[PDB]
């Protein structure tokens, strides 16, 4: 109710992707497709929270994976991530109210833009890391000048959105400590535990939900 008043006052909503908009972690799914799920999956857990320098953790994880372009294509085509229940309807209600919706991820644009298309979110509204490939398709690194490539990158994205569009009320929605750490500069943060409860987030967030339906505030 009071959460509904908050949610309805936003003119922009930024969603974390991994474990919020989708059930999975995009990089762990890619690691599965490339055959090193075990090591990378725990490296990803080890980075969760404000725990390690993100950029180093991403280099090491990708150095084990070595994803080729055709492997990224196969992931998107054959093992696409699962949208969290309710998120399709939630983004639809937001877009019908002219709230600008963004996706922000430390994952990868190829995957996140696939997710955005399913949600009618334009690619201009997607902020993620960009994989590089050689002419033959072999993994060649990633763009380190992206804000999402560095620790604190979600906060840097939101700051860039404020400067570009002058939004008066930007809300960050996400499951982890780095999402909670994006407020400020976000105006409010709503923790999400529908896929996995991070107790550290749930204990310290003013707003926390476990089911995307809870923000649907008028049953239509
Ligand atoms: Ca997340
Ligand atoms: Ca911050």
Q: Which of 11, 18, 143, 211 is catalytic?
A: 18
Widest distance between CA atoms in the chain = 54
The DSSP annotation for 5-55 comes to HHHHT-SEEEEETBTTTBSS-HHHHHHHHHT-HHHHHHHHHHHTTT-S-HH
Phi, psi torsion values for 72, nearest 5 degrees: -65, -40
Residue 18 annotated as binding site: yes
Which tokens belong to 66?
A: 């070595």
**Ligand closest to the CA atom of residue 157:** 2
Which tokens belong to 214?
A: 């809870």
Domains and CATH numbers, the chain: 1-25+77-130+143-220 (3.40.50.1000), 26-76+131-142 (1.10.150.210)
How close is the Cα of 152 to the center of ligand 2, in Å?
Answer: 7
Catalytic residue flag (residue 187): no
């Amino acid at each position: 109710s009071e959460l509904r008043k908050l949610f309805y006052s936003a003119d922009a909503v930024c969603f974390d992707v991994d474990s919020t908009v989708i059930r999975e972690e995009g990089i762990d799914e890619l690691a599965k497709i490339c055959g090193v799920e075990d090591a990378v999956s725990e490296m990803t857990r080890r980075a969760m929270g404000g725990a390690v320098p993100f950029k180093a953790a991403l280099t090491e994880r990708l150095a084990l994976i070595q994803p080729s372009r055709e492997q990224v294509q196969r992931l998107i085509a054959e093992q696409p991530p699962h949208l969290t229940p309710g998120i399709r309807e939630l983004v639809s209600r937001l877009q019908e109210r002219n709230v600008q919706v963004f996706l922000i991820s430390g994952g990868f644009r190829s995957i996140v833009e696939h997710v955005a298309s399913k949600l009618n979110i334009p690619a201009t509204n997607v902020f993620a890391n960009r994989l590089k490939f050689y002419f033959n398709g072999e993994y060649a690194g990633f763009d380190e000048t992206q804000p999402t490539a560095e620790s604190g990158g979600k906060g840097k994205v939101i700051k860039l959105l404020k400067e570009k569009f002058h939004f008066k009320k930007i809300i960050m929605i996400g499951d982890g400590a780095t999402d909670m750490e994006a407020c400020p500069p976000a105006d409010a943060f709503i923790g999400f535990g529908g896929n996995v409860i991070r107790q550290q987030v749930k204990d310290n967030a003013k707003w926390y939900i476990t089911d995307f339906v809870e923000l649907l505030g008028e049953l239509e």
